């Protein structure tokens, strides 16, 4: 059987699988009263992509397609954004997926830039294509956020310079974090319709364990705070497992966090086949590890393995 | 154990010179240009060169703090002190051209500057204030001196910028005609030569051209379809860096394969320095499947005669 392996990249060499930014830190805390069911950054350790997970970091929380019309009443200009697969073909809602791959998996106000390049050249400019880019916000809580049905709504404040043309949304952060709920899924089909094709929720089963997350802070357009988003594995682990597809000889890999300079093991954890990590820790306190550290696969165990306290 | 290349498709990889997906393969004659990019430079045995770092989202990004302002008619320019990507002060005596990820082209880099203030606000439960706005970083300005620790960012008529910690996230370009992807900026400004460079690359074998991975870039406005060509995808940089596989010879023979049909489509040389050549003359459509990827075949040398692509 092909040996299972984990990337040796450091935290400072990897990206969050739920938002296209570097990982800032490891994080663990109790999650008994939250449902942990993210849809980006979901890959089994034997290489099966789940949820809305795709391979390209820059496509996480990005949309592409075209603007078809203005809806903008009071407050701001609003635009109807027909979205397509990341490769440009029409999204098929009968696929067993929640929404087009990379769609955001949280409730909040996604801030970024919409860029357009027109589909036909301009005859008075030697047939070159016209372009425009402006800031925009995509509310993932709007009743018009229906990515599974092929469209979302984007607002551009007082900017009216948006055409009915091919468009891409590149995420930057959040408009505000007033109601940012990273563990609450949006309605991918809007009001009164349940989500489908979901990666399952994850939780520790063994007494005394918590999930270990990879955390990144997010920029804000305005207001106050230091919002953050937690992923189950880095995006580079998704791409590694997807390519390697090593057989999972049991459903739990024992992994150790190591300092390659000193050669010493710092702590150990369980990497569950479903694609998430648990550790033996109670509470939320500083995780004192070196910047050069990374996880190494040690051996195949099971869900009843008793980890050393982290 | 042996030498491997990622099996990711073009549609699963990112440009190593700008944080966007790869759109297509490209080859054309380059005898009259100097191909010396500084991002996306990694030897096949894992040595990072130039300004190359590992994270796609840090390519063409800067972080640091704003420290000053200059008016320009009704427009605003800001002094942006930059640090290493990990936040520590950049040491210009290091044998690198500039902080890792600094742009490697002359152009008007368009993106968004985001700030989060250093100290909290008591009236907001000691939370930090934030703001983000569009900006342009000219890589041709005399004030573009990243090797010396700073660049200048313009925000048009927006004056809502503080002397606070800041990050610039790139989106694309402000114009097409002044974007020269093969002309390096002056990392130390006027009258000072660049240092720590990854070397220029070129085909030595008669009849060969460099094969590039091309992406189109967004524009803030105006006309055009600008593009940027990298030598290998960013995911190849990360693969070679981790694997650090010994280069048995200085040239790997690689074949582009369709995994569904199992058939080889064309072959190429992957040079140890970190670039690909093909036997082709001219620039014409490269007709390959979207599912295709390169596979290492064998170790050869610079005199291997490739089949015509
Ligand atoms: Cl054009
Ligand atoms: Cl379990
Ligand atoms: Cl804060």
Author numbering:
A (entry chain A): 224 to 533
B (entry chain B): 225 to 533
Give verbatim lines from the article:
Noroviruses are highly contagious, infecting both humans and animals. The human norovirus capsid protruding (P) domain binds histo-blood group antigen (HBGA) co-factors for infection, and a recently discovered bat norovirus (GX) was also found to interact with HBGAs. In this study, we determined the P domain structures of four human noroviruses and one bat norovirus using X-ray crystallography to examine structural features linked to potential interspecies transmission. The principal structural difference was a variable length P2 subdomain loop (Loop A), which was located near the HBGA pocket.
The P domains of GII.9 (AY038599), GII.23 (KT290889), GII.27 (MG495077), GVIII (AJ844470), and GX (MF373609) were expressed in E.coli. The five P domains were structurally equivalent with a root mean square deviation for C-alpha atoms ranging between 0.586 Å (GII.23-GII.27) and 1.645 Å (GII.9-GX). The cross-reactivity of the P domains was determined using direct ELISA with a broad-spectrum human norovirus Nanobody (Fc-NB26) that binds to a highly conserved region on the P domain. Fc-NB26 bound to GII.9, GII.23, and GII. P domains in a dose-dependent manner at concentrations less than 80 ng/mL. Structural modeling of the Fc-NB26-binding site indicated that GII.9, GII.23, and GII. P domains contained most of the equivalent residues that could interact with Fc-NB26. Our cumulative data show that Fc-NB26/NB26 binds most GII genotypes, and the epitope is vulnerable and a therapeutic target region for GII noroviruses.
